[PDB]
Every structure is written in C-alpha cells, then in structure tokens.
Amino acid sequence: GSKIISAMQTIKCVVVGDGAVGKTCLLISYTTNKFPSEYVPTVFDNYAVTVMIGGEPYTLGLFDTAGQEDYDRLRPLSYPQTDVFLVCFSVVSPSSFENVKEKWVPEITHHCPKTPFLLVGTQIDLRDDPSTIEKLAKNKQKPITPETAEKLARDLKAVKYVECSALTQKGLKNVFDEAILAALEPPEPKKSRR
Numbered sequence: 001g002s003k004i005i006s007a008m009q010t011i012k013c014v015v016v017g018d019g020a021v022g023k024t025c026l027l028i029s030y031t032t033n034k035f036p037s038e039y040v041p042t043v044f045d046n047y048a049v050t051v052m053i054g055g056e057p058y059t060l061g062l063f064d065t066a067g068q069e070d071y072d073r074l075r076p077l078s079y080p081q082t083d084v085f086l087v088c089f090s091v092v093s094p095s096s097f098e099n100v101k102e103k104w105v106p107e108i109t110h111h112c113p114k115t116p117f118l119l120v121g122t123q124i125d126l127r128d129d130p131s132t133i134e135k136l137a138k139n140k141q142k143p144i145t146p147e148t149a150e151k152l153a154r155d156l157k158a159v160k161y162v163e164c165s166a167l168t169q170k171g172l173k174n175v176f177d178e179a180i181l182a183a184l185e186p187p188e189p190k191k192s193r194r
Contacts (some may be wrong), residue, residue: 002187003091008050011082011183012061014112017104019090019097020135022123026088027062029166030176035125037167051176058180082183084116085109086175087156090164091121091144101152109156116182119153120175121163 002009013030015023024146025035026113031049032039048061062082066072075157090096097119109117124134127143136142144163164171 001189002184006056007084009055009179009180009184010048010059010060010061011077011084012048012063013082013086013179013183014108015064015086015088016107017088017100019088019100020093020123020126020132022126022132022135023064023088024091025125026086026120027064027124028167029169029172030060030062033167033169033172035166037085037125045071051173051180053173053177053180056158058176058184060176060179064174082116083112084118084179085112086179087094087119089119089121089144089149089153089161090123090165091149092123092127092138093136094142095144095148096136097121097149098146098152105156106185115159115185116179117156117158118175118178118182119149119156119158119161119173121149121165123165124163124164125168126168127165128161 015027028039029037031047046062048059050059064089087100087104087108088099121144122191133141148163160169160178162175164175
C-alpha cells in the first residue's frame, strides 16, 4: 500500500554489462540528458537524480562496476533498497546485446532475480552514425534487428526491452518510467469498470 501517487521511491540502478562499450552516455543523459557529446569524467560522479514519469519524482542512483579507493565491503548495506538492473542492450554492435545474456543475467537475475530487469538499447545515437563502428566495424556497421533483441529479451523476459540513446530519448522516459517502475513497483489496487 504505497502512499498516494508521487514520492521519490528512490531507484538505485545497477547497470550491468557494457553493450557497444558506450553505456556512459546513458548515465550522463540519465541525469543531464546530455551524453559525452558535451560530457566527460572531469568531476566526482556516482549519484541519483530525480526524474518524473507523469508528475511523480523518482530518484535514480546509478551504480556501475567497483572503482573506489575507499574499498567498500564485499557486501554493501544497500540490501534494503531498490537496486534495479539496467542490462545495457547494444543496438549499435553486432549481437553485442547477446553477450549480455552470457554474463549479465548471471549477474542480475541469477543474482537478484526480484523483478527490476530493464533491457535498454544503448549508444543508439551512433546506431545511425559510424561512431559505434570503430567499436566493432566487423560488419562495417550492424545494428540489432527485430529478431535479435526480442530473441534474447525473450530469453530473459526482463521487465521491459527498449531502445534509446542516452541523449536521444525515444524511450528513456520509458526505460526511466520502467527503471523506476522496476524499482518503485506501484500498488495494484486499480479501479475496473472501463
């Protein structure tokens, strides 16, 4: 019975995998909607901002691999929290979204198979640019197909599968509505009688 609508349930997202090695831009836009086109690691990072689905605020605390001199304990005390799982999907690489299955599912659902599973297409701003080509250029270009992505999201049945470059926003408000809907899970006392 969550309190009335709204309220920053706080959504700590655990991004797993790299996907076209371009997940940075996502976190950037996840907070500044301005990926590396005009963003770079020149200041302290790691934080949660508050977004808005339809007028409700939901913080998103992004958490990637380790990388802290402080050396946190093997078991963080964030157990009692959200901790969603943003499986970075790769539509700008050759079936890169599939290595995701190989180690990302064993890192998110085999690890925390609670519900928050969001398959998000990454670096989609280069899916149409040669930018993501050097990333692989094995195929001199190769974006995920409609039989590729659904192919593995069908294998994990995440919370939801989409595509949206960090800065593009063709579905970030959706992955963000999901990432939050995956870490804020609203009550289900809906009213029937259509």
